[PDB]
Amino acid sequence: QLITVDEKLDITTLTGVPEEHIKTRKVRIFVPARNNMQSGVNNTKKWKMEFDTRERWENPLMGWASTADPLSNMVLTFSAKEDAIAFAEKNGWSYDVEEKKVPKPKSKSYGANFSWNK
Amino acid sequence: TSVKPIFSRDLNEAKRRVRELYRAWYREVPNTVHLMQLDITVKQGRDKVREMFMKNAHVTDPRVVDLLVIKGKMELQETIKVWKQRTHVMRFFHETETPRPKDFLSKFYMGHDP
Amino acid sequence: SNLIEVFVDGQSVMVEPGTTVLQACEKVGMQIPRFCYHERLSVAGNCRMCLVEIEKAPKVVAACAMPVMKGWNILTNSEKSKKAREGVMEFLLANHPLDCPICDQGGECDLQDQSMMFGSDRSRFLEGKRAVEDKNIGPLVKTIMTRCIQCTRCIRFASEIAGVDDLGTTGRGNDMQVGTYIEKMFMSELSGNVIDICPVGALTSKPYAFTARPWETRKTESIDVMDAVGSNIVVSTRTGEVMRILPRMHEDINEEWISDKTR
Amino acid sequence: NMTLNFGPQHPAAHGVLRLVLELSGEMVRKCDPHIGLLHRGTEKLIEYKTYLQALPYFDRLDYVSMMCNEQAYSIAVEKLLNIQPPPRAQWIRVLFGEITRILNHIMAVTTHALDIGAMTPFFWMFEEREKMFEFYERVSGARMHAAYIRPGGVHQDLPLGLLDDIYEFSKNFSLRIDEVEEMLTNNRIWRNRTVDIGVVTAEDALNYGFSGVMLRGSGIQWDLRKTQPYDVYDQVEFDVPIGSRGDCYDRYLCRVEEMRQSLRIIEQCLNKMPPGEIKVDDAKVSPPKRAEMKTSMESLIHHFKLYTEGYQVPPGATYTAIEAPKGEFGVYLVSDGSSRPYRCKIKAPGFAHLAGLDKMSKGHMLADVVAIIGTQDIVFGEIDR
Amino acid sequence: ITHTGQVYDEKDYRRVRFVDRQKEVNENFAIDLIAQQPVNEVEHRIIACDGGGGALGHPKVYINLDKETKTGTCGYCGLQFKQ
Amino acid sequence: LKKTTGLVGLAVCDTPHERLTILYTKTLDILKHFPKHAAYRKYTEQITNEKLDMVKAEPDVKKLEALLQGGEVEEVILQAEKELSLARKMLKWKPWEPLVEEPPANQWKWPI
Amino acid sequence: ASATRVIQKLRNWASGQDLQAKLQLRYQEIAKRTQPPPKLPVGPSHKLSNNYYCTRDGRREVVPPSIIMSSQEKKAVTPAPPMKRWELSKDQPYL
Amino acid sequence: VRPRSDVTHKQLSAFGEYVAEILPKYVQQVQVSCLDELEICIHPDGVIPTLTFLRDHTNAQFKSLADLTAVDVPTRQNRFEIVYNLLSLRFNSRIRVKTYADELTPIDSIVSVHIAANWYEREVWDMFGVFFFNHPDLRRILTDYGFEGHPFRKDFPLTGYVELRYDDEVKRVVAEPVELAQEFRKFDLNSPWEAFPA
Amino acid sequence: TYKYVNKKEQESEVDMKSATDNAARILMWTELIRGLGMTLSYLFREPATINYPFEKGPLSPRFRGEHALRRYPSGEERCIACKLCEAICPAQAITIEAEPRADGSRRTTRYDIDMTKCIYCGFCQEACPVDAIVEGPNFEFSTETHEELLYNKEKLLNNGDKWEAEIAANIQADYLYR
Ligand code: SF4
Ligand code: SF4
Ligand code: SF4
Ligand code: FES
Ligand SMILES: [Zn+2]
């Protein structure tokens, strides 16, 4: 038989994350925009949640960038806004969702460019 | 809601298991400090056990608790059946790492991102 | 009312009368390979890289410029509409100078990808290529225009989005070069957008000439503070120093454009 | 049963194996092998790399069979793309596939003996190995860890002259196997330490997923190369060396026999390799020839995109298994439409074999455990992945 | 010092690295070495620089030497050609 | 008659036809409890009946081995009682029932 | 090689094999270095005609898996035809 | 373009129906890839029953377990997708039975059905965190003895959170939070243009 | 096609002659003596070892060995910083940052191959369009300190100048193949 729990699945205790990176890390759920350089829209389809950016100090010996934040390069991809919000809640990371913004329909017709008076 | 029970039907039954594990660790701390020649005090270690067992005191859900002891039991097994040598155990004490202050002024003075 | 039903591969999408064939594919979700068509720029039909095949029709139609009509089935991936792209891409590439490891629109090319996705694997142009003298259009835009696919989006933007009306086509044949007839710099705000809008890397940014390459750039979405329109922008950072700020679309505030100052 | 924690004593090696054991004097009561001393993340790292830049990981998964492993990923990526390699490339892969089997068996038989205490077979056959490595180097550039077998065929045609040398060697290697034999197959002592040690039943071998010589040694007839042909291993003719009274000695004899049968397959490949190209002609999957990318625009674009971004495999998932020298090596490669994989569980013939150590070495002496780790050809790279 | 004027400041400590050691630099600097090669006076409006050696060189590109004032320079070699 | 089966552990079973007829008839019996139109009952009854019929029909074990495949006859014996064990197990499992639970939505959508 | 006949004879005997015929050390039998320059063959798809990629791109003509028994008399069927027994070899059945 | 025989896509398809019919209480979906591979999908409760039928059925003997793995689709409510690939040496065919398990909803163990799984199930717990009831001895296999966190989860940082160095003061190896000297450069590689309808 | 190894086709019934032959095999260790003969035989074979410093094990032109950056005959370094050598490196070894040189040409301000990170795959050799980065023949570059193994543009360019003559010969031999 099933048991009842109203407790938001929080599994922060099982994930195995250091305390500092669960209480000081804000992740943003956003649908990636399109670099204006290209006109393809296949990278503006799935929602992604990305952890907040952290220190990137220069390395003294070779000048390479060096980072102390483990969750930096991690960007998880989630198909829908609801599912991504769920991941933040059970993992205990703070979230600030940004609504998808899709190009509004625009009316175009080759005839217009040859308008008597535009 | 409407979840399936992993091993404990309710926080009550689950807590029973935590009690057992605590006892287990409590009885074991002394042995480890001797079979690993660790440079710690049994009392000190036993407090650490308490620390951990409470670090997760907030969990309210029965399922999460049950896994927590499964995992906890596994750790004990690695320390009583000794497969975890000192380096592994002492890590719990975070002996070498320098503690970080949590005071705002302290962080301000040191790190860009607190 | 005002809702024709056109089928994109039999999906019965319904569109307001007036929607182009390319637009009909978009609502189903398909994306016609396109050059010279920008949403906020007038339809020109220059490239003809968008030829699709409405069902039961002798010739393929220009997606971006064909008012859709009731009943039409687009057959976007029809064997025909692939020869109509496998054979156009043959042409754009034929006169193209292969300096892709110079073209800093390396990974930001809508012509390699549309070639790697919708075009052929080889070339048959055993003949010689062409070369067009470069132009010092300004101190911000580096026009290595031997790259130009004569797609006329610059001449549009430079006339329609910005009112410069300077850039224009000069000549006919395969030496139509889209550069200012006399060398007058393209001095206007909104100038740098040409970079972002030329899919080819013919004219690109001169300060960000060769400092990076796009796959590396980590892209963080932020807000313009130089001016009070608060235009949305994406700051492209590599190994911790900002390399480029390019626009990200906000319908209401900056719809895909940013000022010369804030980039 | 005083736990001895043997194996961090570098006693059977094959990698680093902490075989915690409980031994009543010189009898083993229970063996609990520990693993992960060589876990390195190979499965997670691959998710962050493109298909072609994850090919070098496969050579490192079990590096005594450097290439045969590469063929398994190749095949897998080719299936997902529904592309097949050109005819010459297929024969090559079978040519170097087999050469690699010999290399593994020379490793397994001679390293087995070194732990047993016979040291001269290793030096005899490591010289032959050496000569083979040189084939690798003159074909790939690297002695081992070549990266020659790529997802769409081979990387570069064989040098002009290799086939002839892969002949001279093959023409003679037999005698070298024959010699080892005159030293071990019938030694009055090899037999004893090997015969009737680690017998595995037929039903139990299938149950514990042994899938290798270990099954074949018990008499089960299964060679994925004959049952489910991959590449052109169908066009060749070889005899699987099945065994009876499966035990360390019998399986050994099987490994010496596949060394023999692989020379039969190599001969053919040299006799019948076709004229042709060594990589698919789809610039979409295979990188364009350097003369072409330096004279044709479509080829540069295809070179730039392939090296910088990737194949862009169509979304799907496949489990493709070959017959790597150790046993069934399989890659379950789940793939989203992206150029970089999503999952790539490597099935290692070896994760299953080690598990069997417990059910094989029961009521056995310390020396028996050393013999059984040898008869499983455990390379900790594949097990730990 | 180096090709790019990389010279640790008089106070920088990476100079400790060079203490008791040679800071590796190359006397042969490209910016200068290309200059030495003279402008090729071709007699065709557009010429191609395959890079020298064909397949053993750089991707083939055609240069427009039409501008009478300036000289075409291969984005690859740096070689210059004038009509 | 044979000296031994290829498989190491398996041992030659004398009276193999009798041993198979015993196991085959048992299974048929157990299946008799399965629900009438239960899929497992109809399918396995068909397989087992054909296997017996052949075992009854063939008095030569070598040809018997060819007729129902099975490699060596000893294996067929192991497969039959393995099936007999599962038939007993499934009666307890009641897998003939309808799906336990529908998959959470979008659970099986791979492109993700 | 380069062994006095007697040593060779002792060698061949003690080993029981004509090891001289198949020496391990390589001498002037190995492919000479600097083998001639190679002009490799260009494969298919290099035709300049009737070479449309759309007609040679198995990469994405592949389709989403076929689905059977989605949740959203009859004879028994096996995973595949029962396997065929392997046959003993004829060159060397045993050993 | 690879050669495809539809003989298999038909044989395997039929078998799929056969399995489904015989085990309808658990089979949710049964598909054959375009690569001629069957992939019965079962409710997690059908782990024991569906495997056993395949291990011990005359018309479907699937004796050895090729592999047990768990892809992790973070979006999917049930995060893990335990996949069991099986081989039938009798019918020379492989099938894959895949179930779904969330982080704290354990799956049954099949060590009973195939003892091969004794190790792989420990591997799935160590890397992904799925738990297997009735497992003889479930304990980390690949990760370090004191490792905290399940590594192959998509939500775990590649470099991880801890790295080891020898400290003289304490004369013993000591974890410290990871500090990397050149962070993993995260090249963005997806192109903004799709390839086909799929 | 299968083959039985270690399967006794039949039960040869002991015949005194057979028994004696066998008993002699156990009593006078006949097979053990057979094994000794094999090793005595090789003792007389020529050893295959090479004087390592004086003689070197043969490596053909494709040997990957140690990284070098080549220069055009004129003296202009070949690299034009397209940076796809960085993109395809499997280990993340190559780090490249570039800016337009004063001449106006494209060039790399910093090119750092971390050789300890590099796994010598040879893809960089493959990927370069101008073929500026090549796998040089030298394999002997063992270094006392870890820092020496990290290589900046100046070491690689210097490595390129030192080994250019052989690198050119090696690329000359193998380019038709590629
Ligand atoms: S534009 Fe620049 S990048 Fe795109 S193809 Fe032409 S050259 Fe290569
Ligand atoms: S410049 Fe860019 S935009 Fe203007 S035409 Fe040439 S390509 Fe089209
Ligand atoms: S690829 Fe060759 S040229 Fe392009 S950057 Fe790397 S090295 Fe310089
Ligand atoms: S987009 Fe259709 S004409 Fe250019
Ligand atoms: Zn040039």
For the four alpha carbons of D7, D12, D17 and D19, in that order, the dihedral sign comes to negative
Q: Which one, of D226, D243, D260, F72, lies nearest residue I4 by Cα? A: D243
Q: Chain I partners of A63 at a C-beta cutoff of 8 Å?
A: 110
Neighbours of ion ligand 5 (CB under 5 A): E 49, 74, 76-77, 79
From residue A107, give the alpha-carbon distance in Å to each of C7, C37, C62, D178.
Answer: 19, 13, 17, 83
Amino acid identity, position F99: L
Q: How far apart are the first and last CA of chain I?
A: 39
3-state SS of chain F is: CCCCCCCCCCCCCCCHHHHHHHHHHHHHHHHCCCCCCCHHHHHHHHHHHHHHHHHHHCCCHHHHHHHCCCCCHHHHHHHHHHHHHHHHHHHHHCCCCCCCCCCCCCCCCCCC
Tokens of F53: 């019929």
Q: Which one, of A94, A101, A102, lies nearest residue A28 by Cα? A: A94
Nearest-angstrom CA–CA distance, D99 and D105: 10
Strands (E), G6-91: 66-68
Superfamily for the D1-385 domain:
Cytochrome-c3 Hydrogenase, chain B (1.10.645.10)
Compute, in angstroms, the gap from residue C60 CA to the centroid of ligand 4. 12
Contacts for A77-80 with beta carbons within 8 Å, 24 or more apart?
A: A77/A46, A77/A47, A77/A48, A77/F112, A77/H74, A77/H75, A78/A29, A78/A46, A78/A47, A78/A48, A78/A49, A78/H74, A78/H75, A79/A46, A79/A47, A79/F106, A79/F109, A79/F112, A79/H75, A80/A47, A80/H75
> Residues of H numbered 129-148 whose beta carbons fall under 8 angstroms of chain I's beta carbons: which are they?
none
Q: Which one, of C209, H190, I81, lies nearest residue A35 by Cα? A: H190
**CB proximity list for I17: less than 8 A, separation 6 or greater:** none
Burial (CB count <10 Å: 0-12, 13-18, 19+), residue D45: middle
Residue with tokens 């060769």: C210
Nearest-angstrom CA–CA distance, E73 and I106: 12
The residues pairing with D331 across neighbouring beta strands, listed in sequence order, are: D320, D346
Nearest-angstrom CA–CA distance, H134 and H188: 43
From residue I19, give the alpha-carbon distance in Å to each of C91, D188, D192, I11, I28.
Answer: 88, 17, 20, 14, 14
Which range of residues forms the domain containing residue B20?
Answer: 1-114
Q: Cβ distance I12 to I18 under 8 Å?
A: yes
Angle, vertex CA H9, rays to CA H6 and CA H12, nearest 5: 140
**Would you kindly state where each structural domain of chain D is located, as residue ranges?**
1-385
Please tell me whether residue D34 adopts helix, strand or coil conformation: strand
For the four alpha carbons of B33, B38, B40 and B45, in that order, the dihedral sign comes to negative
Q: Cβ distance D104 to D71 under 8 Å?
A: no
Amino acid identity, position D320: T
**What 8-state DSSP symbol labels residue C186?**
-
The answer on whether C100 is annotated among ligand-binding residues is yes
Nearest-angstrom CA–CA distance, B73 and B82: 13
**CB proximity list for D171: less than 8 A, separation 6 or greater:** G22
Task: Using CB atoms, pick whichever of C20, C110, C249 lies closest to residue A103.
Answer: C249
Half-sphere exposure (Cβ direction) of C90: Cα atoms closer than 13 Å: 18
Tokens of D343: 């999952």
**CB proximity list for C22: less than 8 A, separation 6 or greater:** C32, C34, C37, C50, C63, C64
Q: Which of the residues I94, I97, I109, I124 would you substitute to probe the C interface, choosing the one with the greatest number of C C-beta atoms within 10 Å? A: I97
- Strands H107-108 and H132-133, how do they pair? parallel
Nearest-angstrom CA–CA distance, D279 and D92: 11
Compute, in angstroms, the gap from residue G79 CA to the centroid of ligand 3. 52
Q: Cβ distance E78 to E49 under 8 Å?
A: no
Q: Which one, of D270, D268, D263, D320, lies nearest residue D98 by Cα? A: D263
Nearest-angstrom CA–CA distance, D226 and D222: 8
Q: Cβ distance F88 to H13 under 8 Å?
A: no
Angle between helices D162-184 and D87-116 (to 10 degrees): 30
Cα of H18 to nearest chain B Cα, Å: 31
Torsion, Cα of D62, D68, D71, D73 (10° steps): -20
Nearest-angstrom CA–CA distance, C158 and D113: 80
The residues pairing with I112 across neighbouring beta strands, listed in sequence order, are: I95
Nearest-angstrom CA–CA distance, G20 and G11: 9
| In chain A, alpha helices (H) | 12-15, 20-23, 81-91
Q: Cβ distance H19 to H54 under 8 Å?
A: yes
Residue with tokens 């789809």: D282
The answer on whether C25 is annotated among ligand-binding residues is no
Amino acid identity, position H80: F
Residue with tokens 């009876």: D244
- Strands E40-41 and E80-82, how do they pair? parallel
From residue H12, give the alpha-carbon distance in Å to each of H37, H96, I78.
Answer: 7, 11, 56
Where is B69: in which H helix or E strand? helix B62-80
Nearest-angstrom CA–CA distance, E54 and D292: 11
Interface of E with A (CB under 8 A): 14, 17
Amino acid identity, position I128: C
Which range of residues forms the domain containing residue A31?
Answer: 1-118
Q: Chain A partners of C250 at a C-beta cutoff of 8 Å?
A: 101
Q: Which of the residues B6, B59, B74, B92 would you substitute to probe the A interface, choosing the one with the greatest number of A C-beta atoms within 10 Å? A: B59
Where is H152: in which H helix or E strand? none
Method of determination is cryo-EM
Strands (E), chain E: 40-41, 46-49, 61-64, 72-73, 80-82
Q: Cβ distance C140 to G74 under 8 Å?
A: no
How many residues are given for chain A?
A: 118
Compute, in angstroms, the gap from residue C109 CA to the centroid of ligand 1. 6
Q: Which one, of E82, I81, A8, lies nearest residue B58 by Cα? A: A8
Nearest-angstrom CA–CA distance, D102 and C117: 42
Task: Using CB atoms, pick whichever of B74, B86, B91 lies closest to residue H175.
Answer: B91
- Strands A94-95 and A26-30, how do they pair? parallel
Tokens of F39: 């899929």
Q: Which one, of C165, C61, I6, I63, lies nearest residue D139 by Cα? A: I63
Where is C27: in which H helix or E strand? helix C21-28
Nearest-angstrom CA–CA distance, F34 and F17: 27
Residue with tokens 């004087």: I51
Q: Cβ distance C236 to C245 under 8 Å?
A: yes
Residue with tokens 């045993």: G94
From residue A61, give the alpha-carbon distance in Å to each of E3, E14, E16, H182.
Answer: 19, 7, 11, 11
Sheet with D18-24, edge to edge strand ranges: D2-3, D18-24, D27-34
Q: From the CA atom positions of chain E, what is the Rg in Å?
A: 19
Q: How many CB atoms lie within 10 A of CB E1?
A: 10
- Check E78 against I74: CB less than 8 A apart: yes
From residue D183, give the alpha-carbon distance in Å to each of B72, I27, I32, I35.
Answer: 54, 19, 8, 5
Amino acid identity, position H146: G
Nearest-angstrom CA–CA distance, D334 and B113: 38
Mutate which of C47, C99, C197 for ligand 1? The one with the most ligand atoms within 8 Å of its CB, which is C99
Q: Which one, of E48, D287, I81, lies nearest residue C101 by Cα? A: I81
> Residues of I numbered 63-122 whose beta carbons fall under 8 angstroms of chain A's beta carbons: which are they?
95, 110, 112, 114
Nearest-angstrom CA–CA distance, H80 and H131: 11
Nearest-angstrom CA–CA distance, B14 and A7: 16
Q: Which one, of E58, E57, E5, E3, lies nearest residue E30 by Cα? A: E3
Q: Which of the residues C30, C118, C120, C126 would you substitute to probe the G interface, choosing the one with the greatest number of G C-beta atoms within 10 Å? A: C120
**CB proximity list for D344: less than 8 A, separation 6 or greater:** D43, D46, D47, D54, D331, D332, D333, D334
- The residue whose C-alpha atom lies closest to atom 3 belonging to ligand 3 is I79
**CB proximity list for A24: less than 8 A, separation 6 or greater:** B114
Amino acid identity, position C6: V
Sheet with I94-100, edge to edge strand ranges: I94-100, I106-114, I150-151
| D82-104 as b/e: b if 16+ CB within 10 A | bbbbbbbbbbbbbbbbbbbbbbb
From residue H109, give the alpha-carbon distance in Å to each of B10, C150, D347.
Answer: 24, 65, 19
What are φ and ψ of residue H165, in 5° steps? -145, 160
Half-sphere exposure (Cβ direction) of D96: Cα atoms closer than 13 Å: 35
| In chain D, alpha helices (H) | 42-47, 55-61, 66-81, 87-116, 120-139, 162-184, 190-194, 202-207, 213-217, 224-227, 248-271, 290-293, 297-308, 351-360, 366-374, 380-384
Amino acid identity, position H158: L
Phi-psi region of C217 (alpha: psi -120 to 50; beta: other; left: phi over 0): beta
Burial (CB count <10 Å: 0-12, 13-18, 19+), residue E13: exposed
Nearest-angstrom CA–CA distance, A28 and D120: 64
Q: Cβ distance C114 to H193 under 8 Å?
A: yes
| C97-111 as b/e: b if 16+ CB within 10 A | bbbbbbbbbbbbbbb
Q: Chain B partners of D18 at a C-beta cutoff of 8 Å?
A: 83
Number of domains observed in the structure of chain A: 1
**DSSP assignments along chain I, one per residue:** -B-BBS---S-PPP-HHHHHHHHHHHHTTHHHHHHHHHHHHHHTSPP----TTTS-----TT---EEEE-B-TTS-BS-----HHHHH-TTS-EEEEEEE-TTS-EEEEEEEEETTT-----HHHHH-SS--EEEES------SSHHHHEE-HHHHHHHHHHHHHHHHHHHHHHTTT-
Maximum pairwise Cα distance, chain B: 49
Q: Cβ distance D84 to D78 under 8 Å?
A: yes
Q: Cα I34 vs. chain centroid, distance in angstroms? A: 39
Tokens of D135: 């084939």
**CB proximity list for D164: less than 8 A, separation 6 or greater:** G31
Q: Cβ distance I23 to D104 under 8 Å?
A: no
Nearest-angstrom CA–CA distance, H47 and H108: 7
**DSSP assignments along D208-248, one per residue:** TT--BHHHHHTT----HHHHS--TTTTTS---B--BSS-SH
What are φ and ψ of residue I113, in 5° steps? -90, 120
- Check H13 against G59: CB less than 8 A apart: no
Q: Which one, of A17, B65, A72, B29, lies nearest residue H147 by Cα? A: A17
Sheet with E80-82, edge to edge strand ranges: E40-41, E80-82, E72-73
- Strands I106-114 and I94-100, how do they pair? antiparallel
Q: Which one, of B79, B86, B84, lies nearest residue B36 by Cα? A: B86
Half-sphere exposure (Cβ direction) of I151: Cα atoms closer than 13 Å: 25
| In C95-163, alpha helices (H) | 113-118, 153-157
Nearest-angstrom CA–CA distance, H22 and F38: 8
Compute, in angstroms, the gap from residue C65 CA to the centroid of ligand 4. 7
Q: Which one, of C85, C253, A14, D82, lies nearest residue H193 by Cα? A: C85
Nearest-angstrom CA–CA distance, C66 and C55: 14
Please tell me whether residue B54 adopts helix, strand or coil conformation: helix
Nearest-angstrom CA–CA distance, H68 and F31: 32
Nearest-angstrom CA–CA distance, D370 and D365: 9
Task: Using CB atoms, pick whichever of I110, I114, I147 lies closest to residue A63.
Answer: I110
Nearest-angstrom CA–CA distance, C37 and C18: 16
Tokens of I10: 């039949």
Amino acid identity, position D191: R
Q: Ligand 3 — pocket residues by CB below 6 A?
A: C 101; I 79-85, 96, 127-128, 130, 132-133
- Strands C141-143 and H172-177, how do they pair? unpaired
Contact yes or no, G with E (3+ CB pairs under 8 Å): no
Tokens of F110: 């791979």
Compute, in angstroms, the gap from residue E80 CA to the centroid of ligand 5. 8
Please tell me whether residue D336 adopts helix, strand or coil conformation: coil
